[PDB]
Every structure is written in C-alpha cells, then in structure tokens.
Amino acid sequence: ILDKIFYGVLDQGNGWLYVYETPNQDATYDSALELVGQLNKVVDQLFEKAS
C-alpha cells in the first residue's frame, strides 16, 4: 500500500480489505502541471516589459 503496489487500503475496525483506487483521478495531472509552469513564465516576462 505505502508505495502503492496495492489498489486499496486496510479499513481497520472492520478488518476488511477495500479498494481506494477507483482508477486515477490525476490522469491529466501532468498536462495541468506543465500548463501552470507556462502561465508563471508568461507572468514574469510581461512584468519585465511593463516597467
């Protein structure tokens, strides 16, 4: 679980093995990550020009 080989978690108190990975929310996460990076770049470039 702790390096995410297993698609689930231990729900202790029930003492049963249950899924947490309802597949990957974050599957377009990296594309977003670049997108942020571009925007920051831009904001910095504009500021130079401005002053």
Partner 1 sequence: HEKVTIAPLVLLSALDHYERTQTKENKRCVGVILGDANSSTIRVTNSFALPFEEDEKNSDVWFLDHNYIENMNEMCKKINAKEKLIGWYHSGPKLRASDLKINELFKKYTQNNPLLLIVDVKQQGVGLPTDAYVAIEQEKTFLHLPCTIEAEEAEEIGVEHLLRIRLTNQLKSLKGLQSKLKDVVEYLDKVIHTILGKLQDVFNLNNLQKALTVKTNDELMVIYISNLVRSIIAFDDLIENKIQNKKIQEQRVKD
Partner 2 sequence: TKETVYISSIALLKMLKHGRAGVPMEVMGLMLGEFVDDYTVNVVDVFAMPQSGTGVSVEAVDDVFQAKMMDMLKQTGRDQMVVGWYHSHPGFGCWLSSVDVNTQKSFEQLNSRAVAVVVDPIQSVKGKVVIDAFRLIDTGALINNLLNKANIQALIHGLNRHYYSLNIDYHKTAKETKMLMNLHYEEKEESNLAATKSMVKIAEQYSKRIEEEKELTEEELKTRPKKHLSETADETLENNIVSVLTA
Query: Which residues here bind partner 1, judged by CB under 8 A?
Result: 28, 31-32, 35, 38-39, 42-43, 45-46, 49-50
Q: How is 3-40 classified by DSSP, letter by letter?
A: TS-SSEEEETTTTEEEE--SS-TTTTHHHHHHHHHHHH
**Token pair listed for 9:** 């978690």
Q: Of partner 1, partner 2, none, which one sits near residue 27, judging by CB under 5 to 8 A according to partner kind? A: none
Contact residues toward partner 2 (CB under 8 A) are: 28, 31, 34-35, 37-38, 41-42, 45, 48
Are 41 and 47 within 8 A, CB to CB? no
Q: Which does 50 bind (CB under 5 to 8 A by kind): partner 2, partner 1, none?
A: partner 1
